[PDB]
């Protein structure tokens, strides 16, 4: 996978937090 | 206030504000002190130089690293490196910025305590945390499941993780990394008479290692090819313009990661310790660890290291397993990028060690809260 | 409103609306709780996994079954399994749907009372009933007369019935079923070194049991054949791609149903307890019980179990009796299909425990109305 | 001719003639092979060293144990250990002396077969037997009834016995023993920076474990005391005279027997598996098992382990039961002493596997005669 | 035929037949060429003089050493030194006598190859070998285990050995030896105006170094004593009868072995590199290395060097360790005596490089066989 | 009061107040004593003449230099030269003016001590210092880093410096300078019969050397050109009007700096000793030494010496290195200008040897404070 921003990666972990919730 | 991420790994400090894509201060974790007489007055001739200052003066300084095998051995100089990091490079007063430190796993609790003491009593920082570097390396790769293989300047460690839930019994740490590779490269460059012995020369052989070395895909056949032909030889120009030429040393140096017995290290190689770490994991999750090998740290940057690692684990692991290695670009900075994610993550703001908790519980608090 | 059928048997919940041909929710009656240190953030907010979710995370969870030997031992987790069944799988509010539970016979009245309390006070259900699983198993076959052999995950029981009129003195329950078969299979797989010890591995040996095992028609000659030739050996692939090979263990495992002394269980085998149950029946009806053995429950699914059972009872029963075994397809779901019939039978709508009767009589009501 | 008893347990071989009060050869079950170059000719520099030879040369050898978790993994080196046992330590030709081997229960039949092959075809021994170590441990105490807890270097197992008649369904084996304790002690000694990584260092941490460690009577309060005061700290001197100091690690190490989750082992502790083994026994005999717990094996030698075990089982077992633990002195050698009794018992001389029976029946004979 | 041992170390050739107790040819490894005009015909005025010829003509020759820091820099003159060694001093034809050469460790493979080429193609010798000088130095002491510290004219190196099995990762070589001591002695003798600048004067200051210098036991107090009193001053008579007087220079010269920073060398001192070499060894063997420090080479001949080395290592090493230094008489010749042993050892006659092996494999063979 | 700088180098005294751009007293360091009878009374006929006095009377005086090879040989006459410098030339009382002396490096400590004694006890000066001439020569250029090549009347020396921090092991001093050039010029002018033998004639050949001589760019081709054509010949007029003509002597004289063997000096030339001095420096700084060769002293004034030096070092140094020579105008006075800077630098006023420190510590103080 190509480089992606921390601004992008954070929202993946916020989405995964909502999935774990 | 925007959080602060300071990867006091070995060899290079990576530091910068949280939420940035890359560390805005990267410099060597070196303190250098003048080696010779002080003949020429009319200058500050200052007692100590750190980072790029020390590199710019390399050949008159006794360079020293105050963190060795991921362990801070020399707190008086490490506190100079932190002072330089905060006040000269980042140009920020730490008493406004909560600082995410990080360290290797399986590391003396005295270190984590002294880092806590120094951060809360020298720099008065509002809050602090000490994440495991390999856990950060998953955040940088957007993963939630995988083995992480971090291979730094001073230590190499494996941490398997599955939807969270790091398996602490399956963690392994090797004490073999880029310094042992540099010193072995010096030992084998002695075999054709480039005598490097000073720490300045150690710092040049680090550059030779970074520029020329690569990992052989098939070490016996690469060794035979370098014996039969000069095609693998490369020429490099020393700071004084003396040309050197290097051959089978070019891949014999990083091969010691896969064959530690070359440096007399007894341990299993990095492929074997990766496999044995997966073998310490419960049998259900191994397929996803094989599918999610994450590589991080500067000594994973060697060309072909991912191909060699995949070959070796595919030889170790059962024939059906889809062995995959996530070794992206910028994996050198992945520990810092993972800290830049974690320190800015909205759920992590519960996790800081506040200074009130330190005033209540002393250095012992950082064993209770941090993993 | 359409009735609701929830077969909280052991091992698997089967649940679904009455009148459906098959249970639309089938999932393991497992609650799993994390075993390890949760280092990443994005976990731990959810701290208990149920059913197929516990299978999807098998290798990081301490799996537990809250119903053991057909007895609910752990009401706090069983109430989680019921919550999951109603709200997540069937996606229905139980306060509109009368729920047919079912349980094994000869079972502590404290269980039937706590199930009543939970159904009427946690889920507020309009009405409830607790049918005997073997009585349900007749409806799915269409019999009115027969031996029922139910053999579940936790218990095995025989209930003879004749035009109605279950003979309560001739009921027998064995406490030997698929969990004892799994644990004995683990004990004998240890004989060639596949060490399974975790509950995740118990859950894999359950799959090995379901995929490979079968019941020998002539155990001594099958054992001699497996000793003399590898033709009976089968290979299976573990979740990590490690191949295992299995031989006489393949039929020695389910043979323990016919020879409980293999697991140290004292009792007579399932053929002998079937015969002794017929021998407790009045001598006029025995010919129709021999002509109507009904087999149900998942551990009756083994290939050849009907042939072995017929051989053994034909050796036990008098030479004239036409021993016949009704072991159809889907006999794994026959208890649920029988509940789907009964709950939708127009004659049965008198039989529900209404919530008014519970408000008048407390848990004791379910001993007065239900058989 | 006087029989021969050779306890090839893990970690230490105990061997000697039957009827002796103590094994006259006790040495570590280690094979070591030179790690480094062969620089200095004029010496045999021999290819392999075993036992005390390997300990005397520890720091230049890659030590390996050919028996792992009570399972012989490396027959080529185990046959060297047997050769050393017979010809160098006991100084006897096995073709005159019938040899009582012993092994742990619930152990791969391939091991018992390969031991049979090796004894009858390499050493030509007149006769052989393979007693279960826990059954032997009764003879050394003089009991006829009890639940034996053997806890070795590689395995721990419980075997309840009543006037004879070992209950094979109630046997349990844990795969947790002194090696897992050594490796966890290494992991926690890393917490204050004594990095032990070589097998020589593993062999030193085994000595630290034997000299310093003890089992806490009340682990939470001992942990709090070691946190509040240095009174529990002890100093030990490494082979090079470097002093180390050890504190809560001193009892956190053997505590993992009671809390296997410290090493990530999921299983119940040794007190819980002892209780569950008694709970697998028929309800009449439990009172005499509680009255006759027999402890054996080197990892039962920890100070206070009997007191802690008695506390934990008295908390588990019903309040009336007279929980008693028979943990005598020399219980480290009780398995050998039990073999020295059994091999010299006149009733046992019927029981040997004769070489004629092996020539008739191959390795399979040792499953038919031996328990 | 009796073997031949030719220690082409730096500064002095030691040569003689194997089995002799002492080298029968000891002479300086010097080639001298006439510096001035050729005024006086009627003489050969020959182009070159070597050894004692060059010393006897010292003041008209530009003396040069063709081996520098253990590395042969000048093969055209080294081949003259070998010719002189064989034909003029030993008076023997090398084509009958297999020649044991020796060299320092960690030395360019081009040297070992060119020595092989020269021995097999110029001198046609039947066989050859190239032992490490420190490995030879054990044989002359009779040890099998120890650190060897060899300190020659051109190089100093540490090699730890244990029952054999030299630890190649713990070898260290310092590039500081008697020439650096001579040049520093010249630099400090300049401090009171004895200007020595010619190579003839370098060769006289070598004699002053050998005759007068000693190693201070407590350098600060010896320096203060030489500052406070003339009692430490000694007078020496130059070849022309000019008296010189020497004071604190007498021990400041060899002190640079312990404080290399005096010559601007950055490396740790010889005591520190001895300790660090023991610290590279596995922790079990360190006690026997401390018990077996072997000193060899001419620059270990200074009075008091053993006492100073013992004091310094006893300050470095743990207080319990029995630090012992084996610095016998004739330790100047111990490398040759060790070669005289090894070349006459009957086990060694397998080890020679035969000329057939060179004709098959060229110079590369001497990396395969020799250590 | 403004400090005083008195460069008692060889051949010429340069003296003057600090802060002046050029020394206001420059005169030869000569003492002359009447050679002949005292025939003519009525005059003082005074016993001694110094400086321009001695030059004005040259042909009746036995001229002598009291400083030889940078070493003061004749303190009774040097004290006359200092007396003349202070009282007759500068016309100042030294007891008000702290005096910065200077001397060459690697010079007998007896000189620095006697200069200290004389300054503090004959001239009662308030304070004194003794800077190394080459360190002063940097200040006049404005460098902080460089090779300094000082080439005086009596000595030539190389001192490498880097941001300060003179490397004392890499200093070299040659004892070859303008007096050896004068004496060789006299020896070769004898080849066409200009017999110069008196010290007056030595003082005339010094003028011939300064006026006519130059350094050949390509000595072999200049020698061939002077052999083939008279174009290189120059005519000079002696004080008595005798014309002399000079040819290949014109560049053969200063060529001896590059080929000391012409005067029988064995040492490497000034280009070779410059390169070898850079080669004693650590490999990182060599590029800045090549970029910063500083030339100073009167014998660097020869036309073409910078071009020849650049050619020779560019032939010696690696092809990439940007060899640059800083040989400015007034480099004859650069040592004095550097003293005029240093003595007026405000940071230096800490560095003076005060007379209180001399009264406390005697001549030994000037080894402790001064470099
Ligand atoms: N491009 C490269 N190729 C090979 N090695 C590299 C490269 N870049 C850095 N390294 C090596 O990686 C190490 C530094 O890695 P780093 O990640 O900064 O350490 P840490 O993990 O302790 O922060 C050094 O040994 C350095 O020589
Ligand atoms: N096809 C099959 N072959 C063998 N065993 C099976 C098969 N299907 C299910 N089982 C076993 O039957 C048991 C589950 O039966 P089930 O009827 O769901 O229990 P219950 O009667 O309590 O509802 C488990 O032990 C499972 O392993
Ligand atoms: N006094 C002691 N205290 C604690 N541990 C001990 C003691 N003696 C032996 N051990 C440990 O017990 C193990 C050896 O037990 P042993 O009975 O010889 O094994 P096995 O049962 O396989 O023969 C080793 O791990 C050793 O460290
Ligand atoms: N008695 C002595 N005291 C001090 N130094 C000595 C003595 N004898 C020899 N040396 C010095 O030792 C060096 C020669 O040692 P040697 O062992 O011959 O060298 P190598 O090890 O290369 O053969 C020379 O520097 C010499 O000056
Ligand atoms: N222009 C010149 N050309 C050649 N040689 C010169 C020149 N000027 C001075 N010299 C020589 O340089 C020497 C004086 O140099 P100087 O720097 O005054 O000595 P010091 O370095 O001891 O002060 C004398 O030998 C003089 O002949
Ligand atoms: Mg890092
Ligand atoms: Mg069922
Ligand atoms: Mg045992
Ligand atoms: Mg030598
Ligand atoms: Mg000068």
Residue numbers in the entry:
A (entry chain F): 17 to 37
B (entry chain C), C (entry chain E), D (entry chain D), E (entry chain B), F (entry chain A): 5 to 375
Sentences from the paper on this structure:
The low solubility of F-tractin in aqueous solutions and its strong bundling effect on F-actin in vitro are significant disadvantages that prompted us to improve the peptide based on our structural data. Based on these insights, we developed an optimized F-tractin, which eliminates the N-terminal region and minimizes bundling while retaining strong actin labeling. The resulting optimized peptide, F-tractinopt, was chemically synthesized, water-soluble, and exhibited minimal actin bundling when used at concentrations up to 100 µM, as demonstrated by low-speed centrifugation assays and cryo-EM. We then determined the structure of F-tractinopt in complex with F-actin at 3.4 Å. The structure of the optimized peptide and its interaction interface with F-actin was nearly identical to that of the WT F-tractin, confirming that we successfully removed dispensable amino acids without altering the core of the peptide. The lower resolution of the extreme C-terminus of F-tractinopt indicates that the removal of more amino acids at the C-terminus would lead to the loss of the helical structure of the peptide, disorganization of interactions, and, consequently, a decrease in its affinity for F-actin. By creating an optimized version of F-tractin devoid of the flexible region, we have shown that the N-terminus is dispensable for F-actin binding and that its removal dramatically decreases actin bundling in vitro and increases the exchange rate in FRAP experiments. We observed a dose-dependent increase of F-tractinopt in the pellet fraction and estimated the F-actin–F-tractinopt Kd to be 8.5 ± 1.2 µM. Fluorescence recovery after photobleaching (FRAP) experiments indicated that F-tractinopt exchanged faster than WT F-tractin, suggesting a reduced affinity to actin.
Actin filaments (F-actin) are an essential component of the cell cytoskeleton involved in numerous intracellular processes, including cell movement, division, and maintenance of cell shape. F-tractin, a 43 amino acid-long peptide, is an alternative to Lifeact for the visualization of actin filaments. The peptide consists of residues 10–52 of the rat actin-binding inositol 1,4,5-trisphosphate 3-kinase A. F-tractin labels F-actin structures without causing female sterility or significant actin defects during Drosophila oogenesis and has been proven to reliably report on F-actin organization in primary neurons without notable effects on cell function. The C-terminal helix interacts with a hydrophobic pocket formed by two neighboring actin subunits, an interaction region shared by many actin-binding polypeptides, including the popular actin-binding probe Lifeact.
